[PDB]
Design a protein around this ligand. Sequence first.
Ligand SMILES: Nc1ncnc2c1ncn2[C@@H]1O[C@H](COP(=O)(O)OP(=O)(O)OP(=O)(O)O)[C@@H](O)[C@H]1O
Ligand SMILES: Nc1ncnc2c1ncn2[C@@H]1O[C@H](COP(=O)(O)OP(=O)(O)OP(=O)(O)O)[C@@H](O)[C@H]1O
Ligand SMILES: Nc1ncnc2c1ncn2[C@@H]1O[C@H](COP(=O)(O)OP(=O)(O)O)[C@@H](O)[C@H]1O
Ligand SMILES: Nc1ncnc2c1ncn2[C@@H]1O[C@H](COP(=O)(O)OP(=O)(O)O)[C@@H](O)[C@H]1O
Ligand SMILES: Nc1ncnc2c1ncn2[C@@H]1O[C@H](COP(=O)(O)OC(=O)O)[C@@H](O)[C@H]1O
Ligand SMILES: Nc1ncnc2c1ncn2[C@@H]1O[C@H](COP(=O)(O)OC(=O)O)[C@@H](O)[C@H]1O
Ligand SMILES: [Mg+2]
Ligand SMILES: [Mg+2]
Ligand SMILES: [Zn+2]
Ligand SMILES: [Zn+2]
Lengths: 211, 211, 330, 330, 161, 161
Amino acid sequence: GSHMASNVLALDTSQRIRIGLRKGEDLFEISYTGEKKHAEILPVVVKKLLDELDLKVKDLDVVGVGIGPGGLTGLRVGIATVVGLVSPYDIPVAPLNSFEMTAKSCPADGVVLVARRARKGYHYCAVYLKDKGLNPLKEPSVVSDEELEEITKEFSPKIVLKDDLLISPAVLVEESERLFREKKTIHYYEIEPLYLQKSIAELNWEKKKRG
Amino acid sequence: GSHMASNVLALDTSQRIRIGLRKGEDLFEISYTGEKKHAEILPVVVKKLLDELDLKVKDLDVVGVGIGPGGLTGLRVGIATVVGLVSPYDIPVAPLNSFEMTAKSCPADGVVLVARRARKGYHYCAVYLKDKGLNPLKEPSVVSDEELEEITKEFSPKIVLKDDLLISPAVLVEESERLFREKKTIHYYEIEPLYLQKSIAELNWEKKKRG
Amino acid sequence: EGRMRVLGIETSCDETAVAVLDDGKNVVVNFTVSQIEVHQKFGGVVPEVAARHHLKNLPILLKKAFEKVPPETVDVVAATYGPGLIGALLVGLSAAKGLAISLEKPFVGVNHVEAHVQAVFLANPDLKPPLVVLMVSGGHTQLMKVDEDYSMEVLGETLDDSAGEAFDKVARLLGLGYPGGPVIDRVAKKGDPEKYSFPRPMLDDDSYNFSFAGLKTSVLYFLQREKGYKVEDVAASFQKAVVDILVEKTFRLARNLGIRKIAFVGGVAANSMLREEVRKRAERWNYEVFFPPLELCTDNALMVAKAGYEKAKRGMFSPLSLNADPNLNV
Amino acid sequence: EGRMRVLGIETSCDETAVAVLDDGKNVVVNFTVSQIEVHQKFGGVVPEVAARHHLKNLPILLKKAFEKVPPETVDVVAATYGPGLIGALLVGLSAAKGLAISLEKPFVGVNHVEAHVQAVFLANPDLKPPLVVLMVSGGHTQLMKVDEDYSMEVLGETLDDSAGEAFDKVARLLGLGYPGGPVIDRVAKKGDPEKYSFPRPMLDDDSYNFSFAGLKTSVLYFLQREKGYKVEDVAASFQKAVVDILVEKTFRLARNLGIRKIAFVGGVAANSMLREEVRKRAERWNYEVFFPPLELCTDNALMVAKAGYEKAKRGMFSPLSLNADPNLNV
Amino acid sequence: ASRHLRFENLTEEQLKRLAKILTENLKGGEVVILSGNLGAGKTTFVKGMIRAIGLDEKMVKSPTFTLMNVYPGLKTIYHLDLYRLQDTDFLSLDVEDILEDEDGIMVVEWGDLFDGFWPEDSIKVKIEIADESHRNVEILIPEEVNFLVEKIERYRKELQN
Amino acid sequence: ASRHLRFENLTEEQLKRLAKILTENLKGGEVVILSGNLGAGKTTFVKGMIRAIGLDEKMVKSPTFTLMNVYPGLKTIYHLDLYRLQDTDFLSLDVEDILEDEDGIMVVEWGDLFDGFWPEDSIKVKIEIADESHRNVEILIPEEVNFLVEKIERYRKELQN
Ligand SMILES: Nc1ncnc2c1ncn2[C@@H]1O[C@H](COP(=O)(O)OP(=O)(O)OP(=O)(O)O)[C@@H](O)[C@H]1O
Ligand SMILES: Nc1ncnc2c1ncn2[C@@H]1O[C@H](COP(=O)(O)OP(=O)(O)OP(=O)(O)O)[C@@H](O)[C@H]1O
Ligand SMILES: Nc1ncnc2c1ncn2[C@@H]1O[C@H](COP(=O)(O)OP(=O)(O)O)[C@@H](O)[C@H]1O
Ligand SMILES: Nc1ncnc2c1ncn2[C@@H]1O[C@H](COP(=O)(O)OP(=O)(O)O)[C@@H](O)[C@H]1O
Ligand SMILES: Nc1ncnc2c1ncn2[C@@H]1O[C@H](COP(=O)(O)OC(=O)O)[C@@H](O)[C@H]1O
Ligand SMILES: Nc1ncnc2c1ncn2[C@@H]1O[C@H](COP(=O)(O)OC(=O)O)[C@@H](O)[C@H]1O
Ligand SMILES: [Mg+2]
Ligand SMILES: [Mg+2]
Ligand SMILES: [Zn+2]
Ligand SMILES: [Zn+2]
């Protein structure tokens, strides 16, 4: 029946592989960085971790997954493997905004700007007011290199998370738990990735104008 | 003979358990957080990690270890296990300043202050100018709650890492490699932990004066 | 009952597909997004599907699958891992490894074109290799050998355009529309296949490979050179050229390998003129020939599940580390 | 040679110690920081040692050990994990697990007081339990049974101050200095042990436990009450009280358990009056008694290595998860 | 402003040599938009390009159905054909993903069907049918990547023959 | 300024009851400095304190040799004796580490030997020998922890007997 989470798996494949697994009082964080592709690592590491903590997937109370913004190939691998994990048992899914996760993974507080380079001369980016929780000063969108500078002045660049983004797996687990407690979880067949990719079609279809 | 490092183990037990293991192009990070004591986790996780990467200790080019400042019990466990790891083979040891590791683990740059509470009304703390590398604006020392505030004004509190310190295991591996390349490694029988603990004996032996 | 139930996944190109298969014979579920689309589906209280949207489609099909098939009954999970689009392959592959971990079942990576060939053995349970297979769809144009143990080699492939691709593009030239294969087949019926020749730099006699690019342009050249031809005659004459290439090589291979059974799979294998030419030569030189049904020849997860069942029987399982290979070679 | 070589570590209290032992008999290395100190050591090109500095001392001893003993020859690693100071235990324990991982050898966690008892079996290789052990140092005052299989129970302990502690503190009162045991032993020789009685609330007859706190204060009370006594007589009379308590209980236990062998280990076991009283009763009631040599009774890693060898022979190995327990109970 | 280079009346071998010279000199992260009618020689052009990454022409197939082929040589060529593309979604996602690969060379048959989508520094290659065995080729090099001009004009040397 | 509380002529049972009342009311992270001559009843006092964490007196031993004993009850008591301590290093490191435990109760026999080391909010307990079966006890409660005063003075109720 209805109880509070004990066993929580969350990963984010939006850049580097980030896996968090809480089991009771025990939280394990694992990250991988190297030449190997996500499809070569993520499933093996997930299996080993679960095995070592004497945990089966059906014993999971929620699974968190990063939904972007991030690298298409990475996101696809992560989300797809999660679908494979939960689909047999309809285990609830916490959709995690990779940029928010990035912001929350920063020790400090205040005003934070997160950016990832797209195609030459463009950048994904968002700005966040971060204290107790975290509040969006501008939602993740695509901008040019010039338009990025507009944002760095228009808001306070107190912390600037650019290009190489640290994600704390602990934060993934914590956010997954939060969404679960707020009844904001979803089914595995309801996942809607943040594809900002799609915005460059319209913004570069003309020139430097959109209104 | 003399070659550049391929296989690098580094951990820090100064607060939470942080383990990094590079093997060629593959870097694995592991952290643990929970009720279990360091002595219950650190050795088992080290063994499992090495085994899964088909790695024996003698194959290691350097071992990094956090030497403080931090919790006495934690540091003792970490350093002692490392001594057990390397002693049979005299594998070189990178001594890691846990506070520096903390500073470098912060995505942003600028001026950073790191603090850990000691006995009520006192704090370990250091201030670091951080850009390319990292430069000490004041070396780790003990201060009172009042004297801490002196430091927050006397320097710019651009980022304030207080009480709960994130250590990136990747950063441990990277620093271990750096010290190894700079021929700054030491023998297992030459380790000298940063015990700031010892400074409270003299600073509280009188009142608020020391000069 | 030592029953082996295999759930197959296929996301190599345009089609998202999930199937469940028992003992390489009994079909339990055989879903394709094509069916879910090509049949109406007014709104829903479960999201909708669209072509080539693998990440959002596959979950849907899995939901459907598990409604009919209780998950714990699945023994083996099988998925295509190449060749094809890395971005697409990865979704099927990754979900399949997901399920393996979840169900604590073993996992099988399947080669897409090898899978296509299983359509022959699904459709002819009694059929024993060796045989030769002409695989000849829009994507694939390949001549393959299957030996006694069920190993496969590719002994010929296209060096440019597939056969289906030749039909599609030439049909555009003749202003017949899309898909090209069917319309040309229909229109050719009432045409003279001996009317026109299509000369071009043809590749080696001994080679078991194909080239159609030059036949495509040869027809273009014709249209902008000649006067007062009839579509029927051009379609018929082009159609003759294509099947003549395909049949000569396929039978020549079979002869030289001393094989007496030949199978044809894929869109182009439907062609009425090809089938006639094939039966003529089959009769004359005393060959068995096999033309599987059409819903098996198009991309689907059943051929994957079959391919998986056969590998699993032989204990040829895949590790969880298996990466998608867009250039996978059989 | 099915030779089992065991490296022992001991860091439970004040002493840092490393030893190597073969087949529970042959001592290869037996280092204590006490020796490295109590013998001169002018500077060095390798750091220096000091008492109770386990983290920096242990590395030193390991270096020494490995110079004499090549590491790969080590079969089993054994370390004290309690009882004692958590902070100290942890260093030995953690380094030992380190070595196990490094050498790919199994690991044995050892109980400090159990280890102390192995001094009896090191020193008397022919000795077979059951026996009773009075363990009676400065830290430890304990009555133990060892049964046929070499299991141990504690059947009596101090409820306050140890015996050695009584000697140390009473010696302070008599102005004799430290350590108390020896000086009192010497001074008592020339004293009358029947001169004074030391009455105080004594605990239960049937109880196998000890209490000395009240004997300590009884002597204080005496000094501030009486006039014109002589140190010799007070020392002698106090010494008599202590050994009388220890011997009565130890023999009574042995009698009631029907054991005929008794062993005495620890500083206080050196006491000349205790030894006499013990031999008297031993003779009268026909008991075997054992007093191990003194360098075995003080904290050292040899008893650990022995304790480890015996557990390893029986395949009673410890996991890498073993935490130090300051309150470990035998 | 972008610099226009015309090559008149190239044989098939000459067209391939020209494609090789272009590709040799590509640094990584470049886009080539192959334009031309059915049968102009777009796929044949790519058979030229692959010489430059140390593979056989055998490997170059029509991507009409596959949509994108990967040729992993000394650099990786991504070979797209957008002929049969009905939606726009595949550009927005999959192709966009590869535009962030700054090591590979993307070449796109029928790229001109979606002319607005491509970056400004894209190289455009337009192939016309001259006769039954000759083609004309026009190459537009944007200023951003202007170093290519000298490399390509040097090829005219071979055509004096 | 710190508040002084004298208890005159306590039996052994009375001294233990007083130690129980003190400890009952400790929140966690407190230090008790036990002062008194050889035989005053410091260790006996701790046998009183442990009643309050739900253990038997059996568990309380002299830490003269062990240096520090751990009693894990409803709260954890750390029981130190610094009698035989020659250096200063053990205070600087090991004891300092436990002063950062804000859940435990530290009680230190012969703490007064290192009077400068202890925090200002430390509770001081001084035991004098009155006769052969009675002790006097003085307790200093710092202002920081002043709530203890009312709790302890209530014990005088038992002593009217
Ligand atoms: N000078 C030439 N350059 C290139 N190809 C030539 C030339 N002369 C003849 N050809 C032939 O023309 C044909 C062109 O086919 P190809 O498939 O390369 O054109 P395409 O533009 O890719 O067609 P599609 O529009 O269907 O993609 C080939 O058979 C090629 O050998
Ligand atoms: N009123 C009393 N309160 C406490 N103890 C008493 C009293 N009267 C007699 N005693 C006895 O005095 C002795 C005190 O011993 P204890 O070891 O507690 O003193 P201590 O201060 O710990 O000594 P040390 O200085 O060696 O640590 C005990 O035997 C105790 O039973
Ligand atoms: N697959 C085949 N099986 C049997 N006979 C064939 C086959 N292919 C061609 N032939 C016959 O063989 C002839 C070509 O070879 P042929 O001149 O007979 O030389 P040979 O038979 O010595 O190889 C064709 O005219 C045809 O009649
Ligand atoms: N361990 C012992 N072994 C043998 N005899 C003992 C032992 N301890 C005491 N005794 C003897 O027994 C006497 C006390 O018990 P005793 O009066 O003989 O009753 P019982 O022998 O029936 O138990 C002592 O005076 C002593 O002579
Ligand atoms: N009757 C036909 N004759 C020739 N070609 C035919 C005929 N029917 C379909 N085709 C061709 O098969 C191709 C489709 O094959 P299919 O759908 O089986 O698999 C792939 O998509 O690869 C199309 O190019 C179509 O023109
Ligand atoms: N001859 C002795 N008589 C009584 N007590 C003696 C004698 N020799 C040492 N001791 C006591 O043993 C104790 C030391 O024991 P040991 O050094 O063996 O182990 C521990 O430290 O625990 C000291 O209290 C000392 O006073
Ligand atoms: Mg083409
Ligand atoms: Mg005491
Ligand atoms: Zn196919
Ligand atoms: Zn001992």
